[PDB]
């Protein structure tokens, strides 16, 4: 094809959680339709960790159409699109955007475009605006065959926009609804293991105990998460495997796990002293505990050497409140399991994983 | 070895939940291992539905030690042993008496003996009597490297018997630790699916509503089990599989499920209407509303010409009753998985598969 690669990547938000992991592992000589090309978009001018990655990176704000056709029509040997991205914001028609201006510059460039993978969430489950009344979310274990709620979400949008835009063109799609995610990016507005391990290090820095902000019920409920890397071996294999082709499919590690012992390995990889959940304790939010305190991590960041990274673009502490007062919100692999996908992470040992890789990437040391 | 076998079994239990699996999948082709020569071992005659295997039986009370080695003693065949049975209590000596009366006849004998599965349960995770005060269990997800508790435990008499005969002989071990088990045999003192299913029989036949009487953290909690094939193929590949030589290791279907979800698949596939839990109604013992009533079952046995069972032979209520009031006993098959067992199953499928095949073997409808 390109060059003489077998199949041409387009990572659509390279720089997220889980675009940051497809810009490695569709390099790797081991990865199905390999060899890859690979093209990255994101918004920002690249960062120094991604400009030593073997990604053809460029900067477009996708939000802008004329922009994106400008940068995107060019590429007419791309094979897979990978859209691992969001506004930022639930704004439906602002996401949906985005989507389309990606279909609207590839498909009529592209000659041999074959797949496109939307990555969405387990929020396809549950996501609820005005609470205080009706509409009752779905149970759990979430399965993907579940009805959509009466609400809008911009996760209906880009299926929407998915299935017909693969539709009148002969092109395969692929929903994935991923977890919690387990990753190392920086530069994520959703990276639960950065924030509690940024958390940890100011913990430590001003010699106080890793205290436990959340609910009872989240630090004693099950709760499931995927490694970021599983994310990019599911989304590669409903790219290249024609029994995944078509389909929706949900994304965890396969197994389950609870907070309060997480909690303890945060500790112990950091060698401080933790505070777990107090009986009768009520939940506190972390967003404010971490307000005003980003001098002390500008300054960590110094003294530390870690790559430059503001309080604000490294650490979603509302998210980690929000994970801190979730339960009852697993997902199930079995469709994926029945279809092939044999992918798994033990996730105390993927949680640990991305702490150490955090480390070598000098986000954290 | 035998006639032009390469792998002789000896299953200790074979009428049992797990035994009547071992039974089936030993016997096939595709079985690692293969081909199978399998012994059964059983207290009571063989049952028809047991005469129609290619299964040597025998008719052993293996409590009686004179009698096991009569009887074991000349099968200088076997290979590998799996011992997948219990006396009827939780009664220590007893049913240590039977694993050792087990060793001390086969392993003299058994000049090319190789292996030795122990079946156990995951109550190696919270086995208490005096559950009024003091001591307390572990915490889910369990772990096969969790510590014994400081209780009196039978599993323990047998890992022991099994580490210390496996080592003075030139043996290797696993120790498996099932969930809940998805069976089908009708002789089975713990059979959750056989139970349920008698009970749907029972209110179909009395024009009564299948009414869940558990508790409300049993009908809403995530619970775990286990298929009686997978744990046969989870020892099989255990008594073959380098890897899992010498180590103790869980066996559920990794993944979890609800009873509030298969308490209505109960009531679909028999085809009845259902009364979930009521909020405020607290747990009915089934054992209590289904005593006197086994007048009911033998008439029904007979009108649908199904094979004969007494009541308290094939259900039991009061283990029903246990699984409705439990809950955080989800255990965790990472350790398994990371060996190298891919083995798996859609736990609602499992339990309308059980479902299914009781009825083509005339236990039920
Ligand atoms: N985060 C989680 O834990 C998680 C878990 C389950 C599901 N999900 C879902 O998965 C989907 C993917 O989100 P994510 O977490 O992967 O996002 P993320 O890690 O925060 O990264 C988002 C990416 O999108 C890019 N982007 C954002 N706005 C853009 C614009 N206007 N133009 C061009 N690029 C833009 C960003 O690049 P810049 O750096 O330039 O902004 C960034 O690379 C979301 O729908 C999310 O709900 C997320
Ligand atoms: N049942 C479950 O759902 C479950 C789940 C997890 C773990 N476990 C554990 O797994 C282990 C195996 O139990 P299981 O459920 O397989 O038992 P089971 O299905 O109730 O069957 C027990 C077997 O042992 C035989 N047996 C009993 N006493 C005997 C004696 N004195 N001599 C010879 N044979 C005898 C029985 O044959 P007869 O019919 O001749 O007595 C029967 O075949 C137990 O430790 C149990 O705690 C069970
Ligand atoms: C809901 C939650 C904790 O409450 C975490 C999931 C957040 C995300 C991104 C879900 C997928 O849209
Ligand atoms: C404990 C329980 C429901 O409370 C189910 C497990 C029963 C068994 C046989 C566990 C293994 O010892």
């Given at each position: 094809?390109?060059?003489?690669?077998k199949?041409?990547?387009?990572?659509?938000?390279?720089?997220?959680?889980?675009?940051?992991?497809?810009?490695?592992?569709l390099?790797?000589?081991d990865?199905?339709?390999?060899?890859?090309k690979?093209?990255?978009?994101?918004?920002?001018?690249?960062?120094?960790?991604?400009?030593k990655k073997?990604?053809?990176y460029?900067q477009?704000?996708?939000?802008?159409?004329?922009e994106?056709?400008?940068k995107l029509?060019?590429?007419?040997?791309?094979?897979h699109?990978?859209?691992?991205?969001?506004?930022?914001?639930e704004?439906?028609?602002?996401?949906a955007?985005?989507?389309?201006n990606?279909?609207?510059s590839?498909?009529?460039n592209?000659?041999?475009?074959?797949?496109?993978?939307?990555?969405?969430?387990?929020?396809?489950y549950?996501?609820?605006?005005?609470?205080?009344?009706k509409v009752?979310?779905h149970?759990s274990?979430?399965?993907?065959?579940?009805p959509?709620?009466?609400?809008p979400?911009?996760?209906?949008?880009?299926?929407?926009?998915?299935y017909?835009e693969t539709?009148?063109?002969?092109?395969?799609?692929?929903?994935h609804?991923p977890?919690?995610?387990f990753?190392?990016?920086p530069?994520?507005?959703?990276?639960?293991?950065?924030?509690?391990?940024?958390?940890?290090?100011?913990?430590?820095?001003?010699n106080?105990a890793?205290?436990?902000?959340?609910?009872k019920?989240?630090?004693?409920?099950?709760?499931?998460?995927?490694?970021?890397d599983?994310?990019?071996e599911?989304?590669?294999?409903?790219?290249v495997?024609?029994?995944a082709?078509?389909?929706?499919?949900?994304?965890n590690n396969?197994?389950?796990?609870?907070?309060?012992?997480?909690?303890?390995?945060?500790?112990?990889?950091?060698?401080?002293?933790?505070?777990?959940?107090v009986?009768?304790?009520?939940?506190?939010?972390?967003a404010?505990?971490?307000?005003?305190?980003?001098?002390?991590?500008?300054?960590i960041?110094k003294?530390?050497?870690?790559?430059?990274?503001?309080?604000?673009?490294?650490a979603?502490?509302?998210?980690?409140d929000?994970?801190?007062?979730?339960?009852?919100?697993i997902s199930?692999?079995?469709?994926?399991?029945?279809?092939?996908?044999?992918?798994?992470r033990?996730?105390?040992?993927?949680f640990?994983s991305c702490?150490d890789?955090?480390?070598?990437?000098?986000?954290?040391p």
């Amino acid at each position: 094809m390109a060059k003489s690669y077998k199949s041409v990547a387009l990572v659509v938000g390279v720089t997220g959680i889980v675009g940051s992991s497809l810009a490695e592992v569709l390099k790797l000589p081991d990865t199905p339709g390999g060899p890859w090309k690979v093209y990255g978009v994101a918004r920002r001018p690249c960062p120094v960790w991604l400009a030593k990655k073997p990604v053809e990176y460029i900067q477009c704000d996708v939000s802008d159409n004329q922009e994106t056709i400008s940068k995107l029509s060019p590429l007419k040997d791309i094979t897979h699109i990978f859209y691992v991205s969001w506004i930022g914001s639930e704004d439906c028609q602002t996401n949906a955007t985005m989507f389309k201006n990606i279909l609207n510059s590839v498909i009529p460039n592209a000659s041999n475009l074959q797949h496109v993978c939307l990555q969405t969430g387990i929020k396809h489950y549950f996501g609820i605006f005005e609470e205080g009344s009706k509409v009752v979310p779905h149970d759990s274990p979430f399965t993907e065959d579940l009805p959509r709620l009466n609400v809008p979400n911009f996760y209906h949008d880009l299926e929407d926009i998915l299935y017909e835009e693969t539709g009148k063109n002969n092109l395969t799609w692929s929903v994935h609804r991923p977890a919690l995610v387990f990753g190392f990016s920086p530069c994520s507005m959703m990276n639960i293991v950065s924030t509690l391990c940024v958390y940890a290090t100011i913990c430590k820095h001003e010699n106080k105990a890793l205290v436990y902000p959340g609910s009872k019920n989240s630090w004693n409920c099950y709760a499931d998460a995927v490694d970021a890397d599983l994310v990019a071996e599911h989304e590669i294999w409903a790219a290249v495997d024609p029994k995944a082709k078509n389909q929706v499919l949900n994304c965890n590690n396969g197994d389950v796990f609870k907070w309060k012992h997480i909690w303890k390995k945060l500790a112990e990889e950091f060698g401080i002293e933790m505070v777990g959940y107090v009986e009768g304790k009520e939940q506190v939010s972390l967003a404010e505990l971490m307000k005003d305190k980003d001098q002390v991590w500008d300054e960590i960041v110094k003294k530390n050497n870690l790559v430059p990274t503001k309080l604000k673009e490294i650490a979603a502490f509302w998210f980690a409140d929000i994970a801190f007062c979730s339960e009852n919100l697993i997902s199930s692999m079995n469709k994926s399991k029945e279809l092939g996908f044999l992918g798994f992470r033990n996730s105390m040992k993927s949680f640990v994983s991305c702490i150490d890789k955090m480390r070598d990437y000098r986000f954290i040391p």
